[PDB]
C-alpha cells in the first residue's frame, strides 16, 4: 500500500512516495525539519511558545466589553484589530488551490479543472489498509448508527447565542451560490464555477439563464406583481428551469437564479428580497445616470449587490456567529499593504462543515400558524398568504437550533445528515484530528475531550475505538461548544479561513476594483459601505419591519 | 456621444459619464488629483523627479558589459536586480483583470467570462465621433495604404540582434498556446481558457483531447516511429482533430495538442521536440518512482515541462530579446516577500503586439534547399525528409527579420498584417499615444519622433494627420528601434509587463507549488531549474546539435 497512508508528515509537510514502502517529507517553508517535519527551527520554537490558543483568543474577544467598546469607536484601533483578524486566518488556505477528490498530489488537472471542489487535505489513498489510513478498524462504524446515537434530535436544543430563522435561512440562501454539488458527477464536483460570491443564486450560473431572468429594461430583473406585491417571475414566463414537484401551480413556480430555491419558502423569501434589492439599485443608478443603457445598469447593480452581500456577511452574519464584542469590519483597504491572493476555490471540507441542519426547528412558525416540514417544503403559497412582512417578523422571533453539542439533527433531514457522513467517506476524507492539525489545532486525546461529556463520548468510543479515526462531520455536530455558543472550536477554526478567502478574495475587493467608479460613483459605493441585514429588509419589505440575526 | 470619448482622465484615472455630456474622473490611488487626475501629489512629484526613463534604464542594461559580468557572478546582487525587474513591471497590469472588447466599464461578465481576451485599455465607445475618440478624421486611413506604404518588405532587413529561425519558430510555437483567437466569436475572444503557460499546445485544451493524445502507459504521450525517429501520432490513429488542407496524406497528418501546428513545419519541429521531452521526463520520473502509476507520471511530467518552458522563456528567450548584459533569472522565490497575484488573463493588446510577422524570412533555408512560403506551408514532408537535426542546424544558422524600423513584413503574409490592423479597429483599440500613456511612456509629439526618420513619417502624416490617432500595431512595426535592436521602446514596455504576468503568475510559481515534491522530488525539480533551449534540443534531437536564439 501507499507509504503515505499513515499521514506521517507533520506541520503542513508534504508526503511523497520514494519507493513501494518508502516515503519522504518535503518540509519546505513549514518552519520544521527532520524526517517528518517535527523538529522546529529556532524562530519557530519561539513562535509556538508565544502564540495563544484559539480558545484563549476567543475568550478575549468575548469578554472585556468595556475595552472593546473603546476599541470599536476608535477607527484606527478597530482597523488594526480587523487587519490582524484577516491576516491571521489568510495563511491557512492553499491559494492557488492544490488537491481534490481525485488528486492527492498537485497537478495541472486539479489546478485548472473548475468543476471540482478543492481539498484542504488530500484524500486517503485508494489502497490504504484502513479508511483513515492505517489506524482504526477495517470499516468505519455504520453511518446510520453514528447518526442515531449521537446526531439525531431527541428534544429541540435552542441555540444559546439566539440565532433565529432569519439567520438560518440567510445561511442557506447565501451558501447555496457556492455549494452546488453536481450529483451527476459526484460529491467532489461543483456546479458553481465562480467558486465564491458571484450571486449566481440570483442571476443564474450561465449567461443563458441570466438573460432569461432579465427584463432588458433599466438593468432590471423580470418580476410579477401578485396582490400588489413584487415576486420573482414564473417558470412558464421565463423558461428558466427550476426544481418543482409536478403538482405545484404555474403561478407559484417562481423562477430565480438558483434552481433549488423553490424547495423552501424561507429561501424564496430571500430570493424575493434580493430581486427587489437589485431593481431598487437599478432605480437609484438610473437616477444618477440617465445616460446609461440597460446593460451597464444591470452589471453595475450586480457589482453593488455582491458588495452589499459581503458587507452584510461580515458585519452582521459572521459578527453574530462569532459572539465577539469587537465589531468586525468590511474594508478591502485593510489588505492593500498585505500579501493576499484575490482568488478563491471552494473547498469540499468547507461544504461539509457547513451542513448546519441542527439549525432547523421542529416546526416553522409564521404568524399564528405552525407548519411541519411536510407542509413547509415546496409551498410558496405560505409566502404569498402571509407576505414578506410577516415572514420577517416571525422568522426574526423564532429561535434556531444549536449546531454543536450533539443530538440536534431533526429527523426530517436524517437522510441528509447520513449523506454527509457517507459522502465524506466516499471522498476519502482524512480524520477529524488530521483536519485539526491542518488548521493548527491540538488533536483530541479522547472522545470525552471532544464532547466535554460522558454519554455520547462512550457511544462514539464503542463505535470508532480510536479518537484518531473519529470523522470530521459528526465530530463538528457533537463537539463541546464554546461557552453558551452555537459552535465548538473546530467549526470556527476551519470555517473562518475558508470564509475569509471567499469574501475578501472576490475581485471587487482588489485595489483596481475597490473604487467609486466601479459602482457608478459615490452613490453606488455608499450602498455597499452602509449595507446591513436591517437596511436590506427595510428598503425591500413593506412596513420596514425590524430584523436581525438574533431573537434577543 | 459618450462624454469619455476624448479619454480625458490621465494617469490611470477612470472616466465615468455623469450625464449625457458630463464626465467625472475617479483618481483613486493614481497619486494624482484634480478634474483630469493631472495635479500630482507631493510624494508623486518626487517619485517622478527620481524616476529614470525606460530608454535610460535600457542604456544601462545594454552597456557597461564588464560591470554586468561582475554583477552576474554575485548571486545576491543578481537576485536583487532581478527582483527589481519583476516588481517594476508588475504594477502595470490589472490583476484581477478588468475590461474587455464588450465592456468599457468593470463588470462581472468581463471578470468571469474566460472566453474573452482582457483589455489593458477599454474600447472606444460605439458612438464616438471618430475611431480614436474625438481626434483625427471621421475614418482612419485605408489599412491597405498603411500596409503598402510603411509595412511591406522591399529589401529584407535582417535583425541586428541576430535573432534566428529557432527564435522565430519558438516565438510562434510558445505564444500560440495562449493566443488562440476564436474566429467564430470574434477577434476579442480566445479558445485558450487557461490564459497562460499551461502547455495546451502539447497536451490539448480539453480533457477529451488530452486523453486521445496520451498512451496511458508510463505517463507518456502517443507517438510513432518513422525511420528510427520519434514523431507525433496521426489524426487517423488518435481521432484528434487537426487543421489540414484536404490534400494532405493521412500519414502526414500529425496530431498534436494545438490544432493549427500542422500549418508550419517549424511548429511541427517544436511539437516533436516537446513531445520527446515529455516522454524523456516520464522515463526519468519512473526511475525515481517505480511505484507511481501512469496518471501521476503524466501529471508530474506536465508540471515539469511547464517549469522548463517558463525557465527557457525567461533565461534564453527574453534574455536574447532584451539585449541585456545582465543575466535574467527564473526564480519564484524572488516574489515570496512581494505583493503579487498568481493569476493571469491574456490581454488582446498582448496578442496584437506579438504579431511579429516581420521576423519571417523570404524563403526557409534547410540544408541545401530554399523553400518559398508556398512550398513550406502545410508541408511536413520537409520535416521527415531533412529530419530534426538538420532543422535545428539550419534554423540556428538562418537570420530572422527586424520587427521595428518599418517596411519588413514579407509580401507572402500581407493579408495577415492587414488583418492585425483591421481587427484592431473592429475591436475599437485606442490610439498608440493612449497606450504609451497607459504604460508610463511619453506620448510621441510627431511622426518623425516615432520613426526616427523622415520618409515613412511623412507618409504616415499624410495618412493619419495627427500623431494622436496613429494606431498601435502599425506604430510598433515602424517605430525607431533601439540602437542595433529588434524592437522600439513601445514594444518592450508593453510586452514585458504582459510577459512577466503570464510567466510568474503561473500557479507553479506560487509558494505552495514551488517545492521539490510538486515535481516528484529534487531530480524532477532540477530538470526545471537547469532547463535551457540548448538542453531541450540536446536531450531530444539526434546528435545533440548546437543551438541558441541568435546567429
Ligand atoms: C446552512 C445551513 C442549512 C440549512 C438551514 C439547510 C436547510 C435545509 C432544509 C430546510 C430548510 C432542507 C429540507 C434541506 C435539505 C437538504 N440540504 Co440543506 N441546509 C443547510 C446547509 C446545506 C449545505 C451547505 C448543503 C450542501 C449543498 C451542496 O453541496 O450542493 C445542503 C444540502 C442539502 C440537500 C442535498 C443537496 C442538494 O443539492 O440539495 C438536501 C436534500 N444543505 N436543508
Ligand atoms: C510570434 C511570432 C510569429 C511568427 C514567427 C508567425 C509565423 C507565421 C507564418 C509562417 C511560419 C505564417 C504563414 C503565419 C500566418 C498567420 N499568423 Co502568425 N506568426 C507569429 C505570430 C502570430 C500571432 C501572435 C497570431 C495571432 C494568433 C491568434 O490570435 O490565434 C498570428 C496569426 C496568424 C494568422 C491568422 C490571421 C489572423 O486573423 O490573426 C495567420 C494566417 N501570428 N504566421
Ligand atoms: C474536469 O474533470 C471531470 C472529471 O474527470 C471531467 O469529466 C470527465 O470527462 C471525460 C472525458 O471528457 C469523460 O470520460 C468519458 O469518455 C468517453 C467518451 O469518449 C466515454 O466512455 C464516457 O462515457 C465519458 O464520456 C468522463 O465521463 C467525465 N467524468 C465525469 C463526468 O466525472 C471534465 O471533463 C473536466 N473538465 C474539463 C473542463 O476538463
Ligand atoms: C517519523 O515517522 C514515523 C512513521 O509514522 C515513525 O515511524 C514509526 O515509529 C514508531 C515508534 O513510535 C513505530 O512504532 C512504527 O513502527 C514506525 N512506523 C513505521 C512504518 O516506520 C518514525 O520513527 C518518525 N521518525 C522520526 C525521526 O521522528
Ligand atoms: C461568454 O461570452 C460569450 C459572448 O457573450 C457567450 O457566448 C454567447 O452565449 C449566448 C447565450 O448562451 C449565445 O446565444 C451566443 O451565441 C454566444 N455569443 C457569441 C458566440 O459571441 C458565452 O456564453 C459566455 N460564457 C459563459 C460561460 O457565460
Ligand atoms: C480637463 O480636461 C478637459 C477636457 O480635455 C479640459 O477642457 C478642455 O480644455 C481645453 C483648453 O483648456 C478647451 O479648448 C476645451 O474647452 C476643453 N476640451 C474639450 C474636449 O471640450 C480641461 O481644461 C481640463 N481641466 C483642467 C482642470 O485642467
Ligand atoms: C464565504 C463566507 C462563508 C460564510 C461565513 C460564515 C461562517 C463560516 C463558517 C463557519 C465558521 C464559524 C463561525 C464564523 C464566525 C465567527 C468566527 C470568527 C470570524 C473571524 O475570525 O473572522 C472572520 C473573517 O474571516 C471574515 O472575513
Ligand atoms: C502570457 C504569457 C507571457 C509569457 C511571455 C512570452 C512572451 C513575452 C516575451 C516578450 C514580450 C515582448 C517584449 C519584451 C521582451 C524583452 C524586453 C525585456 C524584458 C524585461 O526587461 O523584463 C523581463 C521580465 O519581464 C521577465 O519576466
Ligand atoms: C431520534 C431519537 C433517536 C432514536 C434512535 C435510537 C438509537 C439508539 O441511541 C440511543 O438512544 C438513547 C436515547 O436517547 C440514548 O440514551 C443512548 O445513549 C443512545 O445510544
Ligand atoms: C401549503 O400551505 C398552505 C397555506 O398557505 C396550507 O394550507 C396547505 O395545506 C399546504 N399544502 C401542502 C401540500 O402541504
Ligand atoms: C513539399 O516539400 C517537398 C520536399 O520534401 C517538395 O518536393 C514539394 O514540392 C513540396 N510540396 C508542395 C506541394 O509544395
Amino acid at each position: 500500500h501507499h507509504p503515505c497512508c499513515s499521514n506521517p508528515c507533520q506541520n503542513r509537510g508534504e508526503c511523497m512516495s520514494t519507493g513501494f514502502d518508502q516515503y519522504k517529507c518535503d518540509c519546505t517553508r513549514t518552519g520544521f525539519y527532520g524526517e517528518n517535519c517535527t523538529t522546529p527551527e529556532f524562530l519557530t520554537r519561539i513562535k509556538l511558545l508565544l502564540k495563544p490558543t484559539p480558545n484563549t483568543v476567543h475568550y478575549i474577544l468575548t469578554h472585556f466589553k468595556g475595552v472593546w467598546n473603546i476599541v470599536n469607536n476608535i477607527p484606527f484601533l478597530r482597523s488594526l484589530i480587523m487587519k490582524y483578524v484577516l491576516t491571521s486566518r489568510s495563511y491557512l488556505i492553499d491559494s492557488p488551490p492544490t488537491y481534490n477528490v481525485h488528486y492527492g498530489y498537485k497537478s495541472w488537472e486539479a489546478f485548472s479543472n473548475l468543476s471540482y471542489y478543492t481539498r484542504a487535505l488530500p484524500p486517503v489513498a485508494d489502497d490504504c489498509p484502513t479508511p483513515m489510513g492505517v489506524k482504526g478498524n477495517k470499516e468505519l462504524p455504520d453511518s446510520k448508527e453514528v447518526l442515531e446515537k449521537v446526531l439525531l434530535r431527541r428534544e429541540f436544543i435552542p441555540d444559546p447565542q439566539g440565532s433565529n430563522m432569519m439567520f438560518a435561512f440567510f445561511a442557506q440562501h447565501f451558501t447555496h451560490q457556492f455549494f452546488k454539488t453536481d450529483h451527476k458527477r459526484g460529491p467532489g464536483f461543483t456546479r458553481g464555477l465562480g467558486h465564491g460570491v458571484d450571486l449566481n443564486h440570483i442571476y443564474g450560473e450561465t449567461l443563458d439563464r441570466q438573460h432569461k431572468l432579465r427584463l432588458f429594461k433599466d438593468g432590471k430583473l423580470k418580476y410579477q406583481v401578485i396582490g400588489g406585491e413584487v415576486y420573482p417571475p414564473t417558470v412558464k414566463d421565463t423558461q428558466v428551469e427550476m426544481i418543482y414537484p409536478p403538482h405545484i401551480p404555474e403561478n407559484l413556480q417562481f423562477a430565480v437564479g438558483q434552481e433549488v430555491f423553490g424547495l423552501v419558502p424561507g429561501l424564496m423569501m430571500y430570493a424575493t428580497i434580493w430581486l427587489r434589492e437589485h431593481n431598487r439599485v437599478c432605480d437609484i443608478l438610473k437616477q444618477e445616470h440617465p445616460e446609461w443603457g440597460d446593460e451597464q445598469l444591470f452589471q453595475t447593480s450586480r457589482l453593488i449587490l455582491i458588495g452589499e452581500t459581503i458587507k452584510i456577511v461580515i458585519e452582521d452574519y459572521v459578527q453574530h456567529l462569532s459572539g465577539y464584542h469587537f465589531k468586525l469590519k468590511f474594508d478591502p483597504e485593510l489588505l492593500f499593504n498585505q500579501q493576499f491572493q484575490y482568488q478563491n476555490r471552494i473547498a469540499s471540507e468547507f461544504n461539509t462543515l457547513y451542513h448546519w441542519h441542527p439549525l432547523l426547528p421542529d416546526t416553522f412558525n409564521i404568524e399564528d400558524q405552525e407548519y411541519s416540514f411536510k407542509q413547509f417544503l415546496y409551498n410558496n403559497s405560505i409566502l404569498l398568504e402571509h407576505g414578506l412582512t410577516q415572514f420577517v417578523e416571525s422568522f426574526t422571533r423564532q429561535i434556531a437550533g444549536r449546531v454543536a453539542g450533539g443530538r440536534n439533527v431533526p429527523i426530517a433531514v436524517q437522510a441528509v445528515a447520513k449523506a454527509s457522513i457517507d459522502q465524506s467517506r466516499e471522498m476519502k476524507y482524512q480524520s477529524l484530528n488530521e483536519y485539526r492539525k491542518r488548521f493548527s489545532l491540538k488533536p483530541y486525546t479522547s472522545f470525552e475531550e471532544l464532547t466535554g461529556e460522558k454519554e455520547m463520548a462512550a457511544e462514539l468510543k464503542a463505535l470508532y475505538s480510536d479518537i484518531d479515526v473519529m470523522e470530521l462531520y459528526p465530530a463538528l455536530l457533537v463537539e463541546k461548544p464554546r461557552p453558551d455558543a452555537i459552535f465548538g472550536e473546530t467549526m470556527v477554526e476551519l470555517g473562518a479561513p475558508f470564509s475569509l478567502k471567499g469574501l475578501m478574495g472576490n475581485p471587487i475587493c482588489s485595489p483596481q476594483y475597490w473604487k467609486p467608479s466601479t459602482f457608478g460613483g459615490e452613490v453606488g459605493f455608499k450602498i455597499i459601505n452602509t449595507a446591513s441585514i436591517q437596511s436590506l429588509i427595510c428598503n425591500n419589505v413593506k412596513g420596514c419591519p425590524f430584523t436581525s440575526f438574533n431573537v434577543q
Side-chain angles (χ1 to χ4, degrees), chain A residues 1-42 44-138 140-183 185-207 209-326 328-373 375-525 527-551:
Chain A
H1 71 76
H2 205 291
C4 294
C5 284
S6 74
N7 311 308
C9 308
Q10 309 300 301
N11 304 305
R12 313 279 337 264
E14 301 189 12
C15 195
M16 180 188 72
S17 63
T18 46
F20 287 103
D21 312 304
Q22 292 156 321
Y23 69 86
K24 189 186 171 63
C25 298
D26 187 354
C27 309
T28 302
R29 287 177 294 278
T30 63
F32 293 83
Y33 60 98
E35 198 193 317
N36 307 316
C37 318
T38 58
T39 315
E41 287 167 8
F42 185 89
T44 307
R45 209 186 287 270
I46 303 307
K47 288 182 185 184
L48 293 167
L49 289 159
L50 271 59
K51 184 198 185 82
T53 64
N55 284 343
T56 294
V57 173
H58 178 87
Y59 180 94
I60 293 166
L61 291 160
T62 62
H63 294 75
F64 315 106
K65 210 206 178 206
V67 174
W68 293 115
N69 281 341
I70 296 161
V71 170
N72 293 338
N73 294 303
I74 308 296
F76 182 83
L77 291 170
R78 192 187 172 198
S79 297
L80 201 163
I81 303 292
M82 192 62 201
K83 189 161 92 168
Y84 154 76
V85 171
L86 292 177
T87 55
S88 61
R89 303 201 171 273
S90 181
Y91 87 95
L92 281 153
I93 306 306
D94 290 342
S95 183
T98 49
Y99 314 112
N100 67 30
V101 71
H102 290 157
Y103 293 93
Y105 52 91
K106 288 159 203 64
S107 72
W108 197 261
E109 173 70 16
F111 166 71
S112 68
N113 190 327
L114 300 177
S115 287
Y116 289 92
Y117 287 119
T118 196
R119 284 282 282 272
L121 282 179
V124 179
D126 292 342
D127 67 5
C128 291
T130 67
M132 290 310 176
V134 303
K135 289 187 169 196
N137 297 319
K138 202 168 92 76
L140 285 159
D142 199 296
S143 59
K144 189 183 85 79
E145 201 170 346
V146 169
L147 173 76
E148 291 193 331
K149 283 181 169 167
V150 308
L151 297 189
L152 287 187
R153 180 172 291 163
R154 274 74 174 162
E155 173 175 16
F156 178 64
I157 304 164
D159 172 36
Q161 268 176 259
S163 298
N164 61 22
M165 288 307 105
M166 291 300 287
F167 172 89
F169 283 122
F170 189 97
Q172 198 190 1
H173 186 261
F174 168 71
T175 60
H176 280 221
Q177 77 194 282
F178 53 73
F179 303 140
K180 305 197 296 171
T181 299
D182 188 354
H183 297 292
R185 295 200 199 266
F189 297 86
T190 183
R191 277 174 292 108
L193 305 188
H195 287 268
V197 187
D198 60 12
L199 272 56
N200 75 81
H201 66 327
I202 300 171
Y203 298 110
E205 177 73 24
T206 59
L207 197 57
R209 193 168 176 89
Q210 183 203 109
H211 284 196
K212 290 190 206 169
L213 289 171
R214 279 173 63 182
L215 187 58
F216 290 98
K217 182 183 175 194
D218 298 326
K220 294 181 174 186
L221 293 171
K222 287 177 88 78
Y223 61 95
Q224 59 181 326
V225 186
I226 307 172
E229 288 286 300
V230 165
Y231 289 102
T234 72
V235 163
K236 179 67 79 145
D237 179 31
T238 51
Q239 297 188 313
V240 161
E241 296 193 13
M242 295 284 302
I243 311 295
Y244 286 107
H247 67 272
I248 304 303
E250 173 188 321
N251 32 81
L252 298 164
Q253 279 175 53
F254 300 140
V256 293
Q258 157 66 276
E259 56 286 342
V260 312
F261 279 3
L263 172 73
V264 165
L267 293 167
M268 203 53 73
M269 173 200 62
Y270 276 116
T272 301
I273 287 167
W274 284 107
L275 185 159
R276 291 178 183 182
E277 179 57 15
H278 172 92
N279 290 358
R280 188 190 70 96
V281 171
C282 287
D283 289 330
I284 288 156
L285 291 171
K286 186 177 190 66
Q287 183 152 45
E288 286 308 300
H289 303 282
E291 80 283 1
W292 274 13
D294 167 78
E295 188 69 17
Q296 192 166 4
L297 285 167
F298 169 83
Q299 299 289 347
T300 313
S301 296
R302 180 172 191 162
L303 295 183
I304 285 163
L305 270 64
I306 288 168
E308 288 198 70
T309 304
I310 298 162
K311 169 77 171 188
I312 288 168
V313 173
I314 294 175
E315 302 199 6
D316 292 317
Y317 177 91
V318 173
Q319 180 70 50
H320 166 76
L321 273 177
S322 71
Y324 304 161
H325 296 309
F326 172 67
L328 304 169
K329 196 190 189 198
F330 175 46
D331 183 4
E333 279 177 48
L334 299 176
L335 292 173
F336 294 174
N337 68 332
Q338 301 300 302
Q339 277 182 290
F340 184 84
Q341 297 299 305
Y342 296 104
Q343 56 176 283
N344 189 53
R345 195 77 62 82
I346 299 292
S348 177
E349 299 96 338
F350 188 36
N351 193 339
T352 299
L353 71 79
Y354 234 119
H355 293 237
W356 298 349
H357 293 93
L359 282 172
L360 295 176
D362 293 330
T363 60
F364 300 87
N365 312 337
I366 297 149
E367 212 160 323
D368 49 334
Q369 304 289 329
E370 289 183 350
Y371 300 107
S372 64
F373 271 82
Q375 295 171 324
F376 204 63
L377 256 73
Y378 292 109
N379 198 343
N380 290 324
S381 69
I382 295 172
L383 184 55
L384 262 61
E385 196 190 17
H386 292 285
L388 260 61
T389 310
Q390 270 296 330
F391 256 64
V392 171
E393 293 171 333
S394 291
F395 287 154
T396 303
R397 289 185 78 176
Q398 180 175 12
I399 200 151
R402 200 188 207 173
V403 176
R407 290 170 180 172
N408 207 32
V409 174
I411 308 163
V413 294
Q414 67 175 339
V416 189
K418 194 187 174 281
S420 299
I421 306 170
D422 287 336
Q423 291 165 3
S424 283
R425 302 174 178 187
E426 196 194 322
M427 290 184 294
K428 316 279 207 168
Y429 270 30
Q430 287 185 42
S431 80
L432 163 74
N433 278 343
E434 294 302 332
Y435 279 100
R436 281 185 63 85
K437 295 191 278 179
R438 172 57 181 80
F439 287 81
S440 306
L441 309 179
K442 190 178 187 282
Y444 286 121
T445 54
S446 73
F447 289 96
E448 283 188 0
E449 197 186 22
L450 163 70
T451 75
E453 161 267 16
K454 273 174 269 180
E455 187 169 290
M456 294 184 292
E459 296 302 334
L460 289 170
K461 170 69 187 169
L463 291 158
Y464 287 95
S465 297
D466 195 335
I467 184 62
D468 287 332
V469 303
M470 181 55 192
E471 304 171 80
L472 176 64
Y473 176 72
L476 292 163
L477 307 202
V478 300
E479 188 173 39
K480 178 196 175 176
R482 262 69 175 276
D484 307 308
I486 198 180
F487 294 145
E489 185 196 19
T490 310
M491 186 74 79
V492 176
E493 295 299 304
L494 269 59
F498 290 132
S499 167
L500 169 280
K501 277 298 289 188
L503 292 161
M504 303 307 296
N506 194 284
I508 80 155
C509 298
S510 71
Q512 280 307 83
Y513 277 74
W514 192 248
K515 288 173 179 182
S517 56
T518 298
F519 312 101
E522 297 294 359
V523 177
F525 208 36
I527 293 167
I528 297 177
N529 294 119
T530 59
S532 69
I533 189 63
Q534 178 67 97
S535 75
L536 181 67
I537 270 62
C538 192
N539 289 325
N540 302 295
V541 179
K542 197 161 156 82
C544 172
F546 167 90
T547 197
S548 96
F549 287 142
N550 61 305
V551 299

